[PDB]
Amino acid sequence: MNPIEDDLIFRVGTKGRNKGEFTNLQGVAASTNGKILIADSNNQCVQIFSNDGQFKSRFGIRGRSPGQLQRPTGVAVHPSGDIIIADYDNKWVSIFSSDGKFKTKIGSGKLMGPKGVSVDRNGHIIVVDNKACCVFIFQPNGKIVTRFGSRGNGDRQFAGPHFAAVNSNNEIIITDFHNHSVKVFNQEGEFMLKFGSNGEGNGQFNAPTGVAVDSNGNIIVADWGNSRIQVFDGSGSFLSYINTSADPLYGPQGLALTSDGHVVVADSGNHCFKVY
C-alpha cells in the first residue's frame, strides 16, 4: 500500500460559492499576460487566477438580462484582455472588459445552446453551439463570417460539439463529445481531419471535452468519460497520457495552455483546477 506520484504541478480550489470556490467548473482559458480563467455554470461567474494559482478577481451577476450570466460554459480571452463568455441558457456570447464590465453580446437569436468559445489569430470569435451541433465564426461586431456543422455522425457533422482550440495555422479543433472524436477545420470552416474512436485504449475517447494546442503544436484533449488527458501531435497521432494517477481527475471539463507553457484542466468532480 505505497504512495504514488504523478505529473501534477499544483491544484487550486474547493467546493463552494465564495471567491476561490467552485460548484460546476466548465470553461478554462489562459491569457498571454499570465492569468488562468475559470467559468462556473452554477455559481454564474468567471474567476481569474495567476499562473501560481493566486486568486486575482471574480465577476458575474446571475440573471437572464444582457450583462448577466445564467449558465456560463465556455470562456476565452482576446489578446486585448477582453473576456468572452458563452451562456448555454441565455443563448448569447458576452464580451467583457478585463475588469469584468459588460461591453456587448453577439449571437442573440442565432444560438441554441453554446459551450466552447475561442478567439483565432484574426480576432474572430469561434462559438461551439452544442445544442445546434454547429460552429459559428463571428466578427466581434456580431456579423457571422461562417457556420459549419449539422447533427449526426458524418465527418462534417457533430453530436454535442463541446470545446474548440486554434493551432498556429488558424485551424479550428473541435471536441465531438458523443462521436468520441476530435475534428479539425480550416479558418473557413472546411473539414481537414478526424481522430479518435470510442474506447479506453491509446488515442481512444469516452466523451472528449477540453482541448488546447501547446507551444510544440501538440493537441491536448481531456476525456470526460475516462477522466484522463491525452497528448497527440498536430495530425492526431497519439503521443502520451498526462500521468494523473496519483490525484485522479473526476470528469475533466475545460483545458488550456498557460503562458508559462503548462496544461490547466478543470477537475469538475474535485471542485478544483489542476496544472501539469
Residue-range definition of the domain harbouring residue 234 = 1-276
> How far apart are the C-alpha atoms of 222 and 110, rounded to whole Å?
28
- Give the β-pairing of 92-96 and 102-106: antiparallel
Whether the CA torsion 57, 61, 67, 73 is positive or negative: it is positive
By what method was this entry solved?
Answer: X-ray
Residue 43 exposure: Cα atoms within 13 Å on the Cβ side: 23
The one-letter code for the residue type at 192 is M
What letter would DSSP give residue 268?
G
Nearest 5°: phi and psi at 3? -65, 150
- Give the β-pairing of 219-223 and 83-87: unpaired
Q: What is the 3-state secondary structure (H, E, C) of 51-112?
A: CCCCEEEEECCECCCCCCECCEEEEEECCCCCEEEEECCCCEEEEECCCCCEEEEECCCCCC
Q: Which three cell numbers stand for residue 147?
A: 457556420
The angle subtended at Cα 15 by Cα 14 and Cα 16, nearest 5°, is: 115
Resolution of this structure in Å? 1.6
- The answer to whether 96 touches 82, Cβ cutoff 8 Å, is yes
In 3-state terms, what secondary structure has residue 178? helix
Taking the mean position of all CA atoms in its chain, how far away is CA 202? 22
Q: Which ranges constitute the DSSP H helices of 86-210?
A: none
Radius of gyration of the chain (CA): 17
Q: Which residue, 149, 141, 151, is CA-closest to 172?
A: 149
Categorise residue 261: left if φ over 0, alpha if ψ from -120 to 50, beta otherwise.
left
What domain count does the chain have? 1
Sheet holding 219-223, edge to edge: 208-213, 219-223, 228-232, 238-241
The one-letter code for the residue type at 80 is S
> How far apart are the C-alpha atoms of 125 and 118, rounded to whole Å?
6
Nearest 5°: phi and psi at 181? -155, 165
- The answer to whether 15 touches 23, Cβ cutoff 8 Å, is yes
Nearest 5°: phi and psi at 177? -50, -60
Whether the CA torsion 127, 131, 134, 142 is positive or negative: it is negative
- The answer to whether 38 touches 47, Cβ cutoff 8 Å, is yes
- The answer to whether 92 touches 105, Cβ cutoff 8 Å, is yes
The one-letter code for the residue type at 47 is Q
- The answer to whether 163 touches 220, Cβ cutoff 8 Å, is no
The one-letter code for the residue type at 258 is T
- The answer to whether 192 touches 170, Cβ cutoff 8 Å, is no
Strand partners, 231: 220, 240
> How far apart are the C-alpha atoms of 263 and 9, rounded to whole Å?
10
